[PDB]
Amino acid sequence: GAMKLAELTLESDDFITSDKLFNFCKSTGAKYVKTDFIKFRQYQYIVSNCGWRDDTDVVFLENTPVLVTGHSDYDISEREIDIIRLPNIRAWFCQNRNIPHPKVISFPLGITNKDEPNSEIHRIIGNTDRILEVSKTPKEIKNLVYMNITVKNFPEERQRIVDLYSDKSWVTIGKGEVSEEGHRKFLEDMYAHKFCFAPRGNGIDTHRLWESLYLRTIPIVKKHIAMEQFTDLPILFVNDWENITEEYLNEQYDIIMAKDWNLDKLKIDYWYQKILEYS
Ligand SMILES: CCCCCCCCO[C@@H]1O[C@@H](C)[C@@H](O)[C@@H](O[C@H]2O[C@H](C)[C@@H](O)[C@H](O)[C@@H]2O)[C@@H]1O[C@H]1O[C@H](CO)[C@H](O)[C@H](O)[C@H]1O
Numbered sequence: 001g002a003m004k005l006a007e008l009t010l011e012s013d014d015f016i017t018s019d020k021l022f023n024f025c026k027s028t029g030a031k032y033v034k035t036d037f038i039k040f041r042q043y044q045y046i047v048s049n050c051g052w053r054d055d056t057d058v059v060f061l062e063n064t065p066v067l068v069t070g071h072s073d074y075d076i077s078e079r080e081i082d083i084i085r086l087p088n089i090r091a092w093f094c095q096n097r098n099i100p101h102p103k104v105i106s107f108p109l110g111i112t113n114k115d116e117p118n119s120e121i122h123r124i125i126g127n128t129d130r131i132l133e134v135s136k137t138p139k140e141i142k143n144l145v146y147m148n149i150t151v152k153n154f155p156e157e158r159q160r161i162v163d164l165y166s167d168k169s170w171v172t173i174g175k176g177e178v179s180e181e182g183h184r185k186f187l188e189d190m191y192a193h194k195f196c197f198a199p200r201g202n203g204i205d206t207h208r209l210w211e212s213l214y215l216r217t218i219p220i221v222k223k224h225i226a227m228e229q230f231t232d233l234p235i236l237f238v239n240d241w242e243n244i245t246e247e248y249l250n251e252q253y254d255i256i257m258a259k260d261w262n263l264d265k266l267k268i269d270y271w272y273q274k275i276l277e278y279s
């Protein structure tokens with residue numbers, strides 16, 4: 001569905017969450033395994049969720065046509081090549097793809113899972129109803145870029161951004177308030193900017209990336225193989241966090257605003273479809 005970012009319309013159930021992919025695999029030739037159980041597996045081709053999300057099923061990776069991994073900042077890298085090499089696995093949909101292999105397909109981190117057991121932060125920032133609400137209000141641009149990052153999730157890049165662009169007039173620093181109201185302001189604030197700093201965190205993919213896109217705010221991300229399959233989305237990819245200027249962003253805004261984008265990727269259906277196609 002090639003269309004311009006400004007034309008992004010959203011429904012309540014369109015937001016991508018790794019949970020939605022779990023239930024779609026548990027209910028409806030596709031196994032969802034928390035990446036942690038793939039990373040710290042005791043057997044080579046046998047894994048399981050060990051009760052996580054009430055899933056005691058044993059997975060025989062030698063017999064699964066499609067494997068889905070997520071709910072984690074862990075990446076898929078050479079450590080999992082022996083699984084990727086399995087001939088019966090036709091597709092590996094994963095969060096944080098960190099290997100140049102055509103069998104591995106990235107899917108968006110999306111939005112936090114509100115239904116995480118006994119976690120208010122998840123119940124707060126996992127609230128897609130708020131994101132949907134703000135996306136319906138008039139997008140009155142208050143400033144160019146929006147900065148609200150926890151530097152301690154990936155200091156190497158994040159600290160560099162703050163050291164450089166916090167003092168810029170065309171940048172707004174967002175306050176840190178973990179609450180239903182603090183979240184709403186955080187969404188309304190990011191909604192009111194053309195861009196938003198979306199650097200990688202503990203994991204390569206970040207929720208800020210997709211919160212920004214659902215609000216039609218262009219996220220700024222550093223180039224990474226894990227993002228090499230999202231270049232058909234209105235994301236501003238940068239070689240480094242240096243020499244970003246109001247002119248450069250004003251240039252990329254007009255370009256990114258004039259282009260057509262595969263915005264259907266932002267919808268859960270695109271990934272339901274892709275999992276059904278391969279399975
Ligand atoms: C003040 C407390 C800070 C956190 C302390 C714990 C450090 C590890 O926490 C990891 O790094 C953080 C910077 C977050 O990204 C965190 O994310 C989770 O919580 C967010 C609020 C949600 O938004 C996300 O969806 C996701 O549930 C992420 O945890 C996931 O990845 C891990 C591998 O790294 C494990 O697989 C774990 O099981 C997963 O949940």
Ligand SMILES: [Ca+2]
Nearest residue numbers: 004005257259
């Ligand atoms: Ca566009």
Ligand SMILES: [Ca+2]
Nearest residue numbers: 239240242243
């Ligand atoms: Ca540069």
Ligand SMILES: [Mg+2]
Nearest residue numbers: 005006139216
């Ligand atoms: Mg717009």
Ligand SMILES: [Mg+2]
Nearest residue numbers: 098099225226
């Ligand atoms: Mg790499």
Ligand SMILES: [Mg+2]
Nearest residue numbers: 075096203204
């Ligand atoms: Mg990662």
Ligand SMILES: [Mg+2]
Nearest residue numbers: 097225226228
């Ligand atoms: Mg990739």
Ligand SMILES: [Mg+2]
Nearest residue numbers: 004257258259
């Ligand atoms: Mg045009």
